[PDB]
Design a protein around this ligand. Structure first.
Ligand SMILES: Nc1nc2c(ncn2[C@@H]2O[C@H](COP(=O)(O)OP(=O)(O)NP(=O)(O)O)[C@@H](O)[C@H]2O)c(=O)[nH]1
Ligand SMILES: [K+]
Ligand SMILES: [Mg+2]
Ligand SMILES: [Mg+2]
Ligand SMILES: [Mg+2]
Ligand SMILES: [Mg+2]
Ligand SMILES: [Mg+2]
Ligand SMILES: [Mg+2]
Ligand SMILES: [Mg+2]
Ligand SMILES: [Mg+2]
Ligand SMILES: [Mg+2]
Ligand SMILES: [Mg+2]
Ligand SMILES: [Mg+2]
Ligand SMILES: [Mg+2]
Ligand SMILES: [Mg+2]
Ligand SMILES: [Mg+2]
Ligand SMILES: [Mg+2]
Ligand SMILES: [Mg+2]
Ligand SMILES: [Mg+2]
Ligand SMILES: [Mg+2]
Ligand SMILES: [Mg+2]
Ligand SMILES: [Mg+2]
Ligand SMILES: [Mg+2]
Ligand SMILES: [Mg+2]
Ligand SMILES: [Mg+2]
Ligand SMILES: [Mg+2]
Ligand SMILES: [Mg+2]
Ligand SMILES: [Mg+2]
Ligand SMILES: [Mg+2]
Ligand SMILES: [Mg+2]
Ligand SMILES: [Mg+2]
Ligand SMILES: [Mg+2]
Ligand SMILES: [Mg+2]
Ligand SMILES: [Mg+2]
Ligand SMILES: [Mg+2]
Ligand SMILES: [Mg+2]
Ligand SMILES: [Mg+2]
Ligand SMILES: [Mg+2]
Ligand SMILES: [Mg+2]
Ligand SMILES: [Mg+2]
Ligand SMILES: [Mg+2]
Ligand SMILES: [Mg+2]
Ligand SMILES: [Mg+2]
Ligand SMILES: [Mg+2]
Ligand SMILES: [Mg+2]
Ligand SMILES: [Mg+2]
Ligand SMILES: [Mg+2]
Ligand SMILES: [Mg+2]
Ligand SMILES: [Mg+2]
Ligand SMILES: [Mg+2]
Ligand SMILES: [Mg+2]
Ligand SMILES: [Mg+2]
Ligand SMILES: [Mg+2]
Ligand SMILES: [Mg+2]
Ligand SMILES: [Mg+2]
Lengths: 73, 414, 133
RNA sequence: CUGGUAGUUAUGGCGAGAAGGUCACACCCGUUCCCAUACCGAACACGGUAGUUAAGCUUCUCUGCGCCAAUGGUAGUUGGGGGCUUCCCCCUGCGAGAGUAGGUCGCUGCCGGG
RNA sequence: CUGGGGCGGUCGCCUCCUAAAGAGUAACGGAGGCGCCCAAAGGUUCCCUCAGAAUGGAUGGAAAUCAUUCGCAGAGUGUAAAGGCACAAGGGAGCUUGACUGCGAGACUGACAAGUCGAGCAGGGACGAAAGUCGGGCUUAGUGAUCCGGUGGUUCCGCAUGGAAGGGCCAUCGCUCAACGGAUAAAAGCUACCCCGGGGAUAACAGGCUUAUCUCCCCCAAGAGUCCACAUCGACGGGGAGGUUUGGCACCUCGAUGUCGGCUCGUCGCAUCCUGGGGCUGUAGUCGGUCCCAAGGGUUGGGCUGUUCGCCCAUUAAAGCGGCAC
RNA sequence: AUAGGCCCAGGCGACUGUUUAGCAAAAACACAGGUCUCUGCAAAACCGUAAGGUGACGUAUAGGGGCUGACGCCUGCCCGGUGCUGGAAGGUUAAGAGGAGUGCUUAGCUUCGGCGAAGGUACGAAUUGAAGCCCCAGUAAACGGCGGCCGUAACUAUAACGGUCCUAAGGUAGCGAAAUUCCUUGUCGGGUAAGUUCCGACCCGCACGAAAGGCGCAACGAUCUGGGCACUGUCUCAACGAGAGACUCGGUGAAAUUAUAGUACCUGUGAAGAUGCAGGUUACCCGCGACAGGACGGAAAGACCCCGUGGAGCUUUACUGCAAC
RNA sequence: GGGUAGCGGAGAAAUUCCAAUCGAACUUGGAGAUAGCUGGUUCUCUCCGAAAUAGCUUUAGGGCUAGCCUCGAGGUAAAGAGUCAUGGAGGUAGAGCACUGUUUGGACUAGGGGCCCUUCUCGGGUUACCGAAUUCAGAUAAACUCCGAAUGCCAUGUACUUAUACUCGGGAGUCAGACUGCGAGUGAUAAGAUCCGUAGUCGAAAGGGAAACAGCCCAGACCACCAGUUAAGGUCCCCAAAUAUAUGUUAAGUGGAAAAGGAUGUGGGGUUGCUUAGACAACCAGGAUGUUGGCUUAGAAGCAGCCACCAUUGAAAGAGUGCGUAAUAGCUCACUGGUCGAGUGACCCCGCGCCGAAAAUGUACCGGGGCUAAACAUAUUACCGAAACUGUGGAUGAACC
């Protein structure tokens, strides 16, 4: 009566902290905001975080319990 | 939370069918199952396909959903097919009276000898109900009727080597454990000590009568048998030395109880327990007089005893639980008939007297003259005979008593 | 001893590596029966050991059962090939890791405690040590 | 000195106690006008400043709650070896969680009034 | 597909655990969902905070609504589960249709087919004072290709030419094709009358591993045994040995390891049925019981059952239990 | 020398016949008899594309087909379903007939836009159009099917009689542990020292069951089952003798099989069962007569089992077809 | 002598017969049918060298694309590999109880149900019969998390080593895997089981060791050598090397299978009571008196059983430690002076051993012999030991001068 399961959705980080990315590069795939959009980063309709401009990826803390990813040129 | 069951009965011209149903309900309480429904159908001969008429099989299925009963209990032992036909028709689990008793024993049973007896029953009961399933199993999906070297049959020994071989092992094991009883009997038998065996219906009060006579008339009165208001409280024979205040000595033995429509497989096991009763010098049949169906209980008991092999044994029909009635007096006798209350001491003091009339008849009065030099013989008479008077002379001691013929050979010189 | 209900009817056997994380010091009674090596203690073994302790004390003093059988285990009947999904739940076990005080007793003298616990220990599939507070 | 407005994982929070007030801030008085209530000038909005530090507000004290937190030891563990292999032990590196010593009633920037 | 095959179950998609702190990861492993819904349950502006408990109050009851205090979420979030969410992604109200057209640097995911995210540009809008947000919904299921048909549109083609027929292109609709990458528009059984090609890749026999089960031996000792745990037994539990059972596995053999019982012939083990020696005994004696040593020899004629086995008759000192391809 | 063994009791089949050449001789087939049905003569049925035939040089007391199977006693209830037969003339449906209209085209007419006769052409509505099916009746020795519940039955009827519910109708007569019986080696008796077989009473099929016949039944059987007498090397338990072979000699002289072989045993090991590997233990070289434990001996690319988008034969309310009607 | 012929005949019916063929005859042809199946496929050396996986598949022992091999070519801040440093994502091990579930024992009140009840069980008084909260203490988790490693992963560097990487083409094979270690599932925390992950070896690897023994330990064979050094494993003999050195242990052939449990084995520690003003063992007296303590009982007189268990003489003796008696008598202990002249008695921990320990052809659970070390522990050093590495000579591929 079991035997079922969906395809795995290859979620999680797609570029590293300190890595140069082009504009539009997906940084993080996630359900909801495990990580929040930082500066020069946007949240897609499925919570995908992406670089709005070229630059270096930086994962920072944004207040005790939360976390964010920025892109600094 | 005791589960919900439903009980089904069929009067095959049975004398008191009403009781047999009440009893089966009492049994269902004992196994810890809550009787929600009572289905009675009054046919002459039972339907060899579905025990009940195929019409009722729907009338049950209807009441089993309205009351929400997980399984249904049938007052007679059901044939294998008789069961399968109901399993399908009802869509519910089914348990006949035999399987319901076999469950109660299996719980109640706390000695190896007992556990094996009941394992042998359950297996002998179930073996058939698996046979028809074990033969039907893989007749559809088989090895194309075995045109091969494999050899042997999947028809026979699928069951007969799974069950029936272990029934042979379990009987061989039970025989070994009942041959060990002859070695425990050995000393009593050799000492020719008279045995007063209690029988009767469950709850009759016989394990209580025993406890009574052990309080009053045992050198070690620390040891009482298990007594409780449940069906089949006792399942293993006890033997207790009873020494009367006069110094007469017998053994009092308390057995398994009986109950109407006792499975013909359990009956084979019982024979081993009632081994002491069949070899008894006296037989005390205890009936619950307070209950309405006591003439019904008593006859059902005797019919069982005949099957067990209790023949030509002096019987005493003690009627018990007199206190529950207001009309009847406590201690009374009318030949084999004796009315008494197992709770009360006066009752026992009276039952004791009735035993002393049946066993120690050969005990007669005799005079002895024992010199002072052989005091040991005075002690023997103080311990193994009832002294009426104790006279003292200058030459020796002169003592007149009730002694046995065995003592009238030993003390003959006196 | 049985969980009144369970989130999941079937459950991994798990493992018994390491010293028990808690319940390694007698905390309620005077004397305790400490597991020296790891083992599954079934509920049938806990009951056996409990009655054996209790009968010998004669309704005297207290008995704490410090382990509870939280974990079901399943079995396959004889004559059933492997596969066709996990077998039906059979019973209940407490995975006892080494150093876990399984029973504790107070309100009887040392000798009776020490005797009660050796009778209990003989019903358990694990090497035991009697320890006091 | 106080109003505004930021930054900083609560060492910043909560709770308790106390003091202060046209220099703002506040409550407070009113519903004529703009504007309000799925009813209500409570709120929102607008017009006042008689009244008051009582509350919020600001400053000061406190470790009751939280929060932060070593060292040491232990668990675990990469790699390398052993056993008596439900598991256990040794060597090398890394090293928690809990608990404890202790820390904390914030720190930092700009702008206006004083 | 399948711990042989059949029967049963399953077949596509989503969430979790298994999954070993990136991603991925199997089993007829453990749990649940889906084949939609919503004109607002979508967009935007503005405003807001839930559950529960305590306490007091008419019908009012434990629990309706009202008021106060305490309440980081113990609520809610259309719908499983996970990840999120109180600057709310949760709750109100006003206006709306961005549930827009053309696209799209660049990424993720993927054998392919497909799938996913996307700043930004243009057209023309919604809301907003503006900033700005808006290419459906907190996120992740709600689907199905091609071929062939149908309808709508069209500065495309139109078989000499003008048309037309018909085709193309754009948009959209019609099969549980669900065995869900869909053999066809259209598909059930028996074979013991069978045949060919193959396989020890895979079952039935025997062997092997395993030893749950089985047999035997033990530990503890509540009980039984006339008193009496241990003469003889021994529950609840616990620990082993053996490899005769019931099983598990599929490792040798399918270019054949060809058969149950009986007959003939035995041989071996000892966990001993008899006979020999001994300890204990509930060993007075007789007749027994039990354990230790002991494998030298011995260990049956019939009736019934195909029957191993069993039951029975009649014997015997005894009518042992196992192994050796049962 | 050559010439029946017999008897008692069952099952099945009436009987004599027939059959799987070469593993089945039977209880199977046939049979006389029975019944159903078709068939009016260029008969039906059958073979053949047809002609021509068989049927039959027959003619309903005859011919074909189905089922049953001498004889005796019997063969119950059900026509709702399926088939068959008949009826009725509504509904639906084909080709064919019919041709209202509508596209396309164009001689013109064009107020720009569009209209547009005639002819041609592509379609085409109503109406018309049979059998079958749908509907109604019959028919069971057609295919088939033949229940419950509640009381009184004092008995006794396993299955009556009286109420009810449902059904097309509720399994009648007879028979019943059977060539049929799961509980079951059913229970009691007989027969035996001992009887799961056998025979006979009770209980028993959820009712086995009446022409895929039910129940009887003399005669018959290389039929099956049980018992008895005779008789015996069947056996207790084997002995002796004869011939043929075997063996020796002379003559003649194959075969299957075969990687090469100087080819022990034990215990182990190993693709998990070793003459050949290890460690041991035994063992002088070559033959002859014998015996079969092993060489997983020989024989036959396993018949079982699975697999193969391999066959073949058979079935049907699988799909698609075809003859025939 | 004739007739019926294979999409057919014939059949007292069996799938029965139709030329030793019949569920559809024989023969020739279509025809070299087709065969995702089995078998087979022939000279040599050199260089490299897999896979047994994913996805989809009327697919599962077939195939296709990808992955992994090879050949060629290209470009190429070398983009690959390792380590260091730095940054980061991520919730496993462990742990924890803040949440969710599972759970033990107190304490605390609500209540209801037992229990009594002037009562309408409206209200009291009790409860340990349940009870839902509540706190205190204590547990537990694959699908709990206030926490949280080691590793692994992604990056960056102006770091040090190393030598691959990528792109495009030509050619493949593979899609049965096996075992071992570690982490999981399924199973019984069985399997030489099954299914993943991860590493290795086998596969496709010869050599040495493990008696023999694909998958274990050591280690990679280009060829030759009657050279050398080492690895695992060894050094009494088979059999090359120690009858090696030092200090201990074991008596079981333990070593050279096997547990619960059992025990006066033996070595070492560590606490501790008595002790030359005499212990402990034995031997020499004494071991009395009230008194047969009372009750109980026929009898119970230390000693069936119940209840008390005081004093006394001094050296001290229980209202008695075992036997004994019918009860008595009798023998014995405890408990004391005497003799004798050194140790003696409890408890805990560790090492190594013992029992528990029965299978089938033959010793048969060290390969054998045999071993009391030739066993074990700790420490040491020599040697033997491979096709490893080195030496010498030779052959050969690639790259670079
Ligand atoms: N009032 C009353 N109760 C009695 C009497 N005798 C017995 N009982 C009760 O009935 C119960 C049942 O009797 P009991 O002796 O235990 O059962 P039994 O007769 O041994 N039957 P079994 O052993 O088969 O169970 C007793 O436990 C006791 O409570 C009596 O004379 N009067
Ligand atoms: K134990
Ligand atoms: Mg997955
Ligand atoms: Mg969306
Ligand atoms: Mg009783
Ligand atoms: Mg299967
Ligand atoms: Mg299998
Ligand atoms: Mg992961
Ligand atoms: Mg044209
Ligand atoms: Mg598919
Ligand atoms: Mg047949
Ligand atoms: Mg074949
Ligand atoms: Mg195999
Ligand atoms: Mg396979
Ligand atoms: Mg097998
Ligand atoms: Mg074999
Ligand atoms: Mg396998
Ligand atoms: Mg062969
Ligand atoms: Mg022996
Ligand atoms: Mg026989
Ligand atoms: Mg055999
Ligand atoms: Mg005949
Ligand atoms: Mg023949
Ligand atoms: Mg024949
Ligand atoms: Mg004609
Ligand atoms: Mg017939
Ligand atoms: Mg006829
Ligand atoms: Mg008609
Ligand atoms: Mg008989
Ligand atoms: Mg026979
Ligand atoms: Mg009829
Ligand atoms: Mg008929
Ligand atoms: Mg007939
Ligand atoms: Mg004949
Ligand atoms: Mg010759
Ligand atoms: Mg050899
Ligand atoms: Mg021969
Ligand atoms: Mg052969
Ligand atoms: Mg073959
Ligand atoms: Mg046939
Ligand atoms: Mg022929
Ligand atoms: Mg061709
Ligand atoms: Mg060919
Ligand atoms: Mg190479
Ligand atoms: Mg953990
Ligand atoms: Mg976890
Ligand atoms: Mg394997
Ligand atoms: Mg692995
Ligand atoms: Mg290979
Ligand atoms: Mg090798
Ligand atoms: Mg070797
Ligand atoms: Mg090889
Ligand atoms: Mg050297
Ligand atoms: Mg040497
Ligand atoms: Mg080399």
């Amino acid at each position: 009566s079991n035997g079922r399961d969906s395809e795995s959705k290859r979620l999680g980080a797609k570029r590293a902290d300190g890595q140069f990315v082009t504009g539009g590069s997906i940084l993080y795939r996630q359900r909801g905001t495990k990580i929040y959009p930082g500066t020069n980063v946007g949240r897609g309709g499925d919570d995908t975080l992406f670089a709005k401009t070229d630059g270096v990826v930086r994962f920072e803390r944004m207040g005790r319990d939360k976390k964010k990813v920025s892109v600094y040129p | 939370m005791e589960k919900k069951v439903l009980i089904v009965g069929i009067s095959q011209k049975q004398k008191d069918f009403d009781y047999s149903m009440e009893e089966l309900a009492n049994l269902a309480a004992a196994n810890n199952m809550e009787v929600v429904g009572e289905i009675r159908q009054n046919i002459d001969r039972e339907n060899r396909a579905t025990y009940v008429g195929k019409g009722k099989v729907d009338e049950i299925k209807g009441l089993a959903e309205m009351q929400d009963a997980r399984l249904i209990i049938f007052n007679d032992e059901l044939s294998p097919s008789q069961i399968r036909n109901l399993e399908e028709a009802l869509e519910l689990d089914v348990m006949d009276r035999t399987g319901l008793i076999l469950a109660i024993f299996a719980n109640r049973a706390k000695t190896k000898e007992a556990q094996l007896q009941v394992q042998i029953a359950k297996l002998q009961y179930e073996l058939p109900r698996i046979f028809g399933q074990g033969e039907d199993m893989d007749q559809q999906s088989g090895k194309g009727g075995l045109s091969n070297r494999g050899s042997g049959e999947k028809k026979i020994e699928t069951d007969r080597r799974t069950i029936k071989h272990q029934i042979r092992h379990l009987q061989k094991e039970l025989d070994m454990l009942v041959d060990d009883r002859e070695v425990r009997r050995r000393k009593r038998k050799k000492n020719e000590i008279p045995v007063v065996s209690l029988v009767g219906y469950t709850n009759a009060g016989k394990s209580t009568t025993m406890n009574g006579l052990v309080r009053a008339y045992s050198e070690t009165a620390d040891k009482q048998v298990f007594e409780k208001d449940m069906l089949f409280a006792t399942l293993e024979t006890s033997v207790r030395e009873i020494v009367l205040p006069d110094n007469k000595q017998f053994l009092l033995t308390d057995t398994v109880g009986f109950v109407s429509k006792l499975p013909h497989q359990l009956v084979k096991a019982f024979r081993s327990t009632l081994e002491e009763a069949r070899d008894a010098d006296l037989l005390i049949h205890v009936v619950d007089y307070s209950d309405p169906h006591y003439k019904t209980m008593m006859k059902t008991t005797e019919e069982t005893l005949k099957v067990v092999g209790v023949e030509d044994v002096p019987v005493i029909y003690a009627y018990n639980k007199a206190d529950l009635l207001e009309d009847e007096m406590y201690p009374k006798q009318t030949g084999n008939t004796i009315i008494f209350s197992a709770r009360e001491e006066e009752s026992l003091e009276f039952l004791t007297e009735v035993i002393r009339k049946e066993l120690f008849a050969s005990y007669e009065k005799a005079t002895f003259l024992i010199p002072f030099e052989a005091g040991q013989v005075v002690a023997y008479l103080n311990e193994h005979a009832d002294i009426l008077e104790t006279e003292y002379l200058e030459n020796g001691t002169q003592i007149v008593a009730e002694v046995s013929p065995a003592d009238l050979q030993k003390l003959a010189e006196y | 001893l049985v969980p009144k209900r369970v989130k999941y009817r079937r459950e991994f056997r798990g493992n018994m590596r390491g010293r028990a994380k808690g319940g390694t010091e007698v905390a309620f009674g005077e004397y305790g029966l400490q597991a020296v090596e790891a083992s599954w203690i079934t509920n049938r073994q806990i009951e056996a050991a409990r009655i054996a302790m209790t009968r010998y004390m004669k309704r005297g003093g207290k008995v704490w059962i410090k382990i509870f059988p939280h974990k079901s285990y399943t079995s396959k009947p004889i004559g059933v090939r492997m596969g066709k999904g996990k077998g039906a739940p059979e019973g209940w076990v407490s995975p006892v890791k080494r150093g876990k005080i399984m029973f504790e007793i107070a309100g009887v003298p040392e000798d009776v405690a020490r005797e009660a616990l050796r009778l209990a220990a003989h019903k358990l599939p694990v090497k035991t040590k009697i320890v006091k507070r």
